[PDB]
């Protein structure tokens, strides 16, 4: 739908990129990438990389040996990570497109496909020549990680059988051929297993968009890499960390509310953890590890891990006990809101915490080991051989209740810091002579709709079938949440011509007992929907803002084949070219109820720095230096806070149509 | 066997020394030491001590009162320790031999014998005039701590009875008279009790040599005393600590392997500990404390102790979290391998950790309290009255599985530091133009053989019997492990005349599942056998090294009576005069199996600093400043490591003869 135009030169480059996301598990020896790949000599091309040191390091490490082709790559393990990072450096410091391309061809040919794709996807994102380029949605690149094993197996069965043996029989199982695609209907995990109440939320926690979303978040801004590239953004890194989780968690909490599930559970490393996770997914070697209910974190195997983790926390508790201290070669003062940077970087243990370009093995990650122990897997066999859990991958992390429980813990500690900050005062927040006299919102209505994604990358083909470009294409379809578009009409009385910023937040109305929600202690349950600017004339004004224009969300990724068609028309998708790392639009609202679950909308209008000139979106945010999530980035005091340029509207989220996703999947 | 010659002046002094290790529990009032002892006045002789402050402190403390004669001294308790240290200062700062001697005479006469012997043994070792002198093996001085109570009681019975009542009946019990010695055959603890699998290792963990060995290690270099005396060695103290345990533990792990017992168990102070220890030993007041299986460390009595211990560890975890920090008035950087000193001193909490000559009560020992809580004894009655456990003494410490579990924990934390160090590079380790083309090793064969030790010091005599120099002498005999001597023939191709160092390590082949062992993660399971130097000529060379010449081990101590005979022949034992603090030779190999348990030998040849001059052993090590355990003192990367001057030979440890020690002790 929303597109953008592109010259034949961009087209050739884009198709070259996408060729690496096409048949990922296998090698076409006839194909151009293979000829290039097989014999390409990095050493002879040394002067075609910006950074000799990087390439040397790569050749060293590579001649030493990388991970093998049959294993499962995860970034959370040292040696694999380092291999990946070196490969990435290689892609990144390539002189030009051509060399980068030749470098990929090599790596595709010579290396573990998981490692390669991790590296490449990030390089494409992070390279400056490649800004403007497009990467396929992660569920197409790694489809095996966006579906339960039931479906995956059905796919393999159908392929072994070279088609359906009894079409009518297959239809009972949600399998049918549609033109030259085989289509699998896919149920969420709780259609087959309801082990605890968390399964109530599967349509969210398993939603291929939510998971892809987290995968983008990491890809844009990996914990091991410095934010150097982004210049000024670097000094805000910590801020972005906290914001991302605090937002995600708020959105998650909304889902919880509408399923009658309340606040996110706390755990202790010295105690068993009540909430299990039974992953219904596997790998060519092993199944993902399961965590039974009341799994005891404190066993022989974890004793040392727990020590480390306990210390990592106690250390931050000590920071909170002083207000000003020296850590990691910086001098920190918790009265300073800019210290959020340090705090965010502390918890993520990222490159910017130290002054470095990449993290080092001895700089041990709290998140890595939290994930590792929460994951409940047995100890890895060797460095390349471990039992995967959902927290070994960004594609799968959102699937485990424990994920939210972990980041909840971290975020909470970060707000323990936020308490140091002076609450915004009356006269910091006032917009003199402007008043929001009314807010009116359209119908807020959620629903489910079937969605298909191309899952072909999961299918293995034959020597003979590959040269024949024989087609066995696979689509997986499942109900995914969506909502109807809606308008927010804001009526404001500006005394005077002024330029304003309008901000829109969604928040809960009551807690799960009907206690109405007070800002004083519920400010962090506010989810930001929109940020925009408006000319405000004297007298009466009215802004109309449509949920499609909301800046914080994106449209669904277009499939590769569709992107591929658009390229022949000098076209490319807009949203995928620029706006990929945002939350998908359909998920903005939690699942409402047939009778209208109560939330509230917080509209806030405040003075914009004129510019004296015309305005464009991206730099317009950077010109006003308000902290992310303003004015709800720190504790509020209700009475000191409320003001005429604020408005709170009680709203109701309805749901229409079929309420349970499995009803779509009925034979 | 290996002896050395000595003038009549040394002889008189040596016999004077040994007279204090002769009848230790009783006083001969007719004897010369007593006459001297009883009336000797320290105050009047004040000007015969180097250090007035020391002697004053002694007289103060002594007039206050020392520990009583009937109790059991341990160095791990404050007040007793301080008394000991003061006594030691007195012995140490004596002007000359004569005064030192007069000082001992006094202390023997006036003080607790345990305290006295602890003090004296160390003073003899540490005094410069006394270098060259010889101390009896600890199992002769403290025989009660090198045998189970069954045997001790048999000794007392036979003495009360003034001999054997029915020789034939006694023979059933492993008791018989042999000339004028009464001989007791002694079984290891598991012949009478197999409470858990650790009992499989008793022939090692109870071996009187291994235990004596640890006792020497402490005596040479007590945690409470500065390494000032040893000059340059002081800056290496921490290094020696880690090395000693890391070596001992490796040797221990070997024993584990050949008994099918695997890796050393981890514990938690907040959890019960699975491995019990049932000491079969006692004291004139009480039995040693027992730790049942699944003994809970976390009870009211230990709550505070655990806090302290937990903190002591968390503190080091924090050091690891920074790489560079200030602690104990030093600035530490963990990228610097010399920081090992600080690290070793941190864990031992020794005098050199602070800048001091002796430790102070307020400088609370991690090892002391770890020992105390692991020991499972109830809380001491008063300062001189406690229930002993095997970890209250260096003579007994090796007997408890918990000992290895403790030092394992510590060592592991220290290798967590070792990860900071940059792995030796290809060109640090290469020996250009030299190549080990072959290694061939003789038959590696272990066996048991009966060993006797004079245990007479455990026998109480009569007023009448003492003046009559009536003889009731006691020998304890038990099978102890040994092995056949063997040659390592190393074939090397030196391009050129060079001087080299050869090093020999013993290491495991597989883990307990048959996974072959990779240096990357098994470097710390390498046990160093030999360090020597060789002229290497151009063309083909071959070094032949015999296990007797291996520098790291020693021959068995000669008994006092035998030493006593040698003195009448202007002779003294060589090994006991210089080489006492080394591991006994017989234990170098773990117990093999009748069919050949697999290990491997690592030979490594590297360039020696010419000297331009002739070479002697002790300073030849100090001229090349390679860290202890080079090249295996830090993590290795297999591929970066291997080199032509290295060689790895698969080897097999056979065992011959009777496999179980109890079969020697059969009536
Ligand atoms: Na939590
Ligand atoms: Na341990």
PDB file of C-alpha atoms in Angstrom, chain A residues 60 63-65 79 270 298 300 303-304 306-312 314-315 318-319 326 328-329 346 354 362-364 381-383, chain B residues 263-268 270-272 274 310 313-315 317-318 320-324 335 409 413 416 419-420 515 520 637 639-640:
ATOM      1  CA  UNK A  60      42.581 -15.181  12.201  1.00  0.00           C
ATOM      2  CA  UNK A  63      41.214 -20.007  10.034  1.00  0.00           C
ATOM      3  CA  UNK A  64      40.931 -21.072  13.651  1.00  0.00           C
ATOM      4  CA  UNK A  65      37.456 -22.454  12.708  1.00  0.00           C
ATOM      5  CA  UNK A  79      32.396 -17.925  21.143  1.00  0.00           C
ATOM      6  CA  UNK A 270      16.942 -18.270  45.839  1.00  0.00           C
ATOM      7  CA  UNK A 298      18.539 -22.648  43.286  1.00  0.00           C
ATOM      8  CA  UNK A 300      23.914 -27.052  42.272  1.00  0.00           C
ATOM      9  CA  UNK A 303      24.810 -21.831  42.474  1.00  0.00           C
ATOM     10  CA  UNK A 304      27.533 -19.743  40.805  1.00  0.00           C
ATOM     11  CA  UNK A 306      22.911 -17.007  41.136  1.00  0.00           C
ATOM     12  CA  UNK A 307      25.883 -15.529  43.033  1.00  0.00           C
ATOM     13  CA  UNK A 308      26.791 -13.437  40.022  1.00  0.00           C
ATOM     14  CA  UNK A 309      23.210 -12.341  39.416  1.00  0.00           C
ATOM     15  CA  UNK A 310      22.552 -11.565  43.056  1.00  0.00           C
ATOM     16  CA  UNK A 311      25.692  -9.432  43.158  1.00  0.00           C
ATOM     17  CA  UNK A 312      24.810  -7.603  39.952  1.00  0.00           C
ATOM     18  CA  UNK A 314      23.047  -5.747  45.060  1.00  0.00           C
ATOM     19  CA  UNK A 315      25.605  -3.556  43.288  1.00  0.00           C
ATOM     20  CA  UNK A 318      24.335   0.155  46.621  1.00  0.00           C
ATOM     21  CA  UNK A 319      24.255   2.825  43.867  1.00  0.00           C
ATOM     22  CA  UNK A 326      31.870   6.597  40.644  1.00  0.00           C
ATOM     23  CA  UNK A 328      32.811   2.344  35.187  1.00  0.00           C
ATOM     24  CA  UNK A 329      35.032   5.379  34.922  1.00  0.00           C
ATOM     25  CA  UNK A 346      24.270  -0.672  33.458  1.00  0.00           C
ATOM     26  CA  UNK A 354      32.394   0.933  29.046  1.00  0.00           C
ATOM     27  CA  UNK A 362      35.028 -10.772  30.679  1.00  0.00           C
ATOM     28  CA  UNK A 363      32.308  -8.166  30.752  1.00  0.00           C
ATOM     29  CA  UNK A 364      29.702 -10.598  31.923  1.00  0.00           C
ATOM     30  CA  UNK A 381      27.417 -29.786  26.190  1.00  0.00           C
ATOM     31  CA  UNK A 382      30.152 -27.649  24.536  1.00  0.00           C
ATOM     32  CA  UNK A 383      30.292 -24.023  23.280  1.00  0.00           C
TER      33      UNK A 383
ATOM     34  CA  UNK B 263      34.106 -33.391  39.053  1.00  0.00           C
ATOM     35  CA  UNK B 264      34.371 -31.842  42.465  1.00  0.00           C
ATOM     36  CA  UNK B 265      30.920 -30.975  43.938  1.00  0.00           C
ATOM     37  CA  UNK B 266      29.712 -27.377  44.345  1.00  0.00           C
ATOM     38  CA  UNK B 267      27.907 -26.137  47.451  1.00  0.00           C
ATOM     39  CA  UNK B 268      25.953 -23.113  48.624  1.00  0.00           C
ATOM     40  CA  UNK B 270      22.294 -21.112  51.876  1.00  0.00           C
ATOM     41  CA  UNK B 271      21.713 -24.781  51.228  1.00  0.00           C
ATOM     42  CA  UNK B 272      22.469 -28.153  52.717  1.00  0.00           C
ATOM     43  CA  UNK B 274      25.375 -33.323  50.198  1.00  0.00           C
ATOM     44  CA  UNK B 310      28.596 -14.467  51.341  1.00  0.00           C
ATOM     45  CA  UNK B 313      32.658 -13.610  47.919  1.00  0.00           C
ATOM     46  CA  UNK B 314      30.236 -10.959  46.533  1.00  0.00           C
ATOM     47  CA  UNK B 315      33.038  -8.456  47.138  1.00  0.00           C
ATOM     48  CA  UNK B 317      32.472 -10.721  42.303  1.00  0.00           C
ATOM     49  CA  UNK B 318      32.322  -6.890  42.288  1.00  0.00           C
ATOM     50  CA  UNK B 320      35.463  -8.907  38.585  1.00  0.00           C
ATOM     51  CA  UNK B 321      32.704  -6.522  37.487  1.00  0.00           C
ATOM     52  CA  UNK B 322      35.167  -3.575  37.232  1.00  0.00           C
ATOM     53  CA  UNK B 323      38.493  -4.541  35.771  1.00  0.00           C
ATOM     54  CA  UNK B 324      40.409  -1.899  37.658  1.00  0.00           C
ATOM     55  CA  UNK B 335      44.345  -7.294  32.783  1.00  0.00           C
ATOM     56  CA  UNK B 409      35.345 -22.887  45.018  1.00  0.00           C
ATOM     57  CA  UNK B 413      36.893 -17.691  41.436  1.00  0.00           C
ATOM     58  CA  UNK B 416      37.226 -16.302  36.727  1.00  0.00           C
ATOM     59  CA  UNK B 419      39.845 -14.959  32.003  1.00  0.00           C
ATOM     60  CA  UNK B 420      40.894 -11.326  31.896  1.00  0.00           C
ATOM     61  CA  UNK B 515      34.667 -36.846  25.722  1.00  0.00           C
ATOM     62  CA  UNK B 520      40.505 -24.602  26.057  1.00  0.00           C
ATOM     63  CA  UNK B 637      42.953 -21.251  22.774  1.00  0.00           C
ATOM     64  CA  UNK B 639      44.329 -23.386  17.669  1.00  0.00           C
ATOM     65  CA  UNK B 640      46.403 -20.390  18.767  1.00  0.00           C
TER      66      UNK B 640
END
